[PDB]
DNA sequence: GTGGTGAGC
DNA sequence: GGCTCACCAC
């Protein structure tokens, strides 16, 4: 009291696209798109945001627009089953390649749920394509990178944002933003701003108490506040508010430029953000103040298994290692180690060396048992700041096809599928160039296949480039050769009908 | 060198 | 239930 809890160092740190995730005064934001594949379709067919449109594949649903969710339809339903829940459902099948053609297409009006035995899309001579969804994913991304200097791509429909710089700059140099009638930020934060340029301060001096006037700063979106704590008490709250503001803008552009609704979570931790974004859907924005982190993590919807990269199996074990009750398990980890990370550290040691398990089926690395420590201890409190980072360069790319029926008998059929693969792969190589804005070419190509008896033939080798920058053809040129040798490699053995053909590319070069 | 199979879109 | 992708014991 009598002075803010955060120091200048922690504030100024928001302007560093490298040491920003530390401050705790951080302001990260996660954004996921609602019923994505459902939407990009809901958009492509000029339908409305409120039409029970579902995205199907063969006989299974893979995306359910929220309009059609109101009828109880979910992912664990089959087009057939779903229609009995809502006869006005608008099922739309993804685009697909046809055995033999080097281009995918949209067979609208067609689908297994169609009576006409001619408007069917057999899974025998067709392969689902996801370019459309990738094509859109990037757009949204481009729209992001234009509003945020540091953007991490979580997955095809998710992205994290480091609203550090934008918040700091707004908090210091924005002479436009208005709080209400006649009251701009330039007057409400005069004290903090005048002090900033003054430089008269030690980077360790606790910032001044937030000006009484700033409390009239409104948050944008639902502020998780069950206990009803005050909205703006310290700076981290002020920065977060400014974030929600900015964040709303970004999310509005997407909706206007592409027309995609999204859920969004704001907090000082990517992890905590990941949760908040999924807390409410669709088209909403949850906000978890640092002084609500515990109230949020214990609202009664999360567990130690709901934590990204900790809910597959390592999470399962964690329970069998710390007893971890089957409910209020997160809080339990907090109230059992109110010491520090160091405490739980040893507990891990004196819980592994004995007669409980074997280092043959445990994802818990003994030596680095200090990491797993601080991790759980931090997560439990909602303070595990992970720096945003780019996904490591791709190592490979597979264009498979689990064949069925007696389709694949001759080599002209394999060749017929190799064209397809060659297309899809010459479609993910381009999307990669655009992402790293660097030219990419695969120096090696292999072709695997499963015979009738389910055996495995595979030939791998280099790819000759008769020029300097092609692919879509020379890839099939070689691909074929292999598919031939293998054919000869099994003339009088269990071969056709094949049960799985597939082309893979590795040994990439990023010039 | 991988197929087994855990993780995730 | 489907389709892709990174690893790493046997
Ligand atoms: N079981 C599955 N089968 C096929 N595709 C899936 C499956 N699970 C996820 N996907 C992929 C295809 C979808 O376009 C994409 C959607 O992103 P996801 O994060 O799963 O949520 P969603 O967009 O379907 O709904 P939400 O609004 O809850 O985010 O995930
Ligand atoms: Ca989603
Ligand atoms: Ca997702």
């Amino acid at each position: 009291g009598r002075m803010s809890k955060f120091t200048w160092k922690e504030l100024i740190q928001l302007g560093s696209p490298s040491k920003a995730y530390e401050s705790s005064l951080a302001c990260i934001a996660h954004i996921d798109m609602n019923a994505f594949f459902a939407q990009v379709e809901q958009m492509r067919c000029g339908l409305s945001k409120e039409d029970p449109v579902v995205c199907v594949q063969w006989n299974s649903i893979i995306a359910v627009s929220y309009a059609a969710r109101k009828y109880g339809i979910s992912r664990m339903d089959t087009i057939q089953e779903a229609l009995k829940k809502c006869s006005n459902l608008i099922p739309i099948h993804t685009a697909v390649f046809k055995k033999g053609e080097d281009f995918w297409q949209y067979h609208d009006g067609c689908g297994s749920w169609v009576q006409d035995p001619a408007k069917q899309i057999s899974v025998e001579d067709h392969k689902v394509s996801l370019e459309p969804y990738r094509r859109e994913s990037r757009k949204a991304l481009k729209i992001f990178k234009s509003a945020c200097d540091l953007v991490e791509r979580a997955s095809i429909d998710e992205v994290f944002l480091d609203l550090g710089r934008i918040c700091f700059n707004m908090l210091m140099f924005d002479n436009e933003y208005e709080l209400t009638g006649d009251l701009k930020l330039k007057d409400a934060l005069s004290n903090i701003r005048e002090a900033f340029i003054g430089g008269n301060y030690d980077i360790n001096s606790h910032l001044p108490l937030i000006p009484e006037k700033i409390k009239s700063l409104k948050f944008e979106g639902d502020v998780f506040n069950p206990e009803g704590r005050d909205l703006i008490t310290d700076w981290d709250d002020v920065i977060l508010a400014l974030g929600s503001q900015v964040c709303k803008g970004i999310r509005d552009s997407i909706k206007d430029i592409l027309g995609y609704t999204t859920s969004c979570g704001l907090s000082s931790t990517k992890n905590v953000c990941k949760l908040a974004s999924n807390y409410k859907k669709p088209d909403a924005q949850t906000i978890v103040k640092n002084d609500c982190l515990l109230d949020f993590l214990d609202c009664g919807k999360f567990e130690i298994t709901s934590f990204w990269t900790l809910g597959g199996v390592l999470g399962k074990e964690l329970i069998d290692v710390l007893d971890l009750p089957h409910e209020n398990s997160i809080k339990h980890i907090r109230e059992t180690w109110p010491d520090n990370a160091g405490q739980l550290k040893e507990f891990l040691d004196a819980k592994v060396k004995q007669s409980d398990y074997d280092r043959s089926t445990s994802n818990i690395d003994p030596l680095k048992t200090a990491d797993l420590a601080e991790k759980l201890f931090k997560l439990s409190r909602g303070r595990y700041g992970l720096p945003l980072s780019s996904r490591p360069v791709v190592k490979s790319m597979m264009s498979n096809k689990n064949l069925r029926g007696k389709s694949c008998n001759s080599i002209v059929d394999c060749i017929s599928w190799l064209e397809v693969f060659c297309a899809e792969l010459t479609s993910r190589i381009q999307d990669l160039e655009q992402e790293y804005n660097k030219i990419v070419i695969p120096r090696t190509v292999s072709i695997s296949l499963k015979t009738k008896s389910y055996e495995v033939y595979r030939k791998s080798g280099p790819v000759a480039y008769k020029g300097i920058n092609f692919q879509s053809h020379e890839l099939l040129k070689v691909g074929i050769k292999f598919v031939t040798d293998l054919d000869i490699k099994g003339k009088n053995k269990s071969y056709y009908p094949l049960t799985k053909l597939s082309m893979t590319i590795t040994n990439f070069d990023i010039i």
Side-chain angles (χ1 to χ4, degrees), chain A residues 32-36 66 69 157-158 281:
Chain A
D32 175 299
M33 287 191 257
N34 314 305
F36 193 47
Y66 284 72
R69 291 191 183 182
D157 73 342
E158 304 174 355
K281 304 173 299 179

Side-chain angles (χ1 to χ4, degrees), chain A residues 97-101 124-126 407-408 413 416-417 420:
Chain A
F97 289 83
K98 184 172 185 293
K99 187 185 71 170
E101 308 182 312
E124 313 177 65
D125 307 304
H126 292 304
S407 181
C408 242
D413 289 3
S416 287
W417 282 100
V420 174

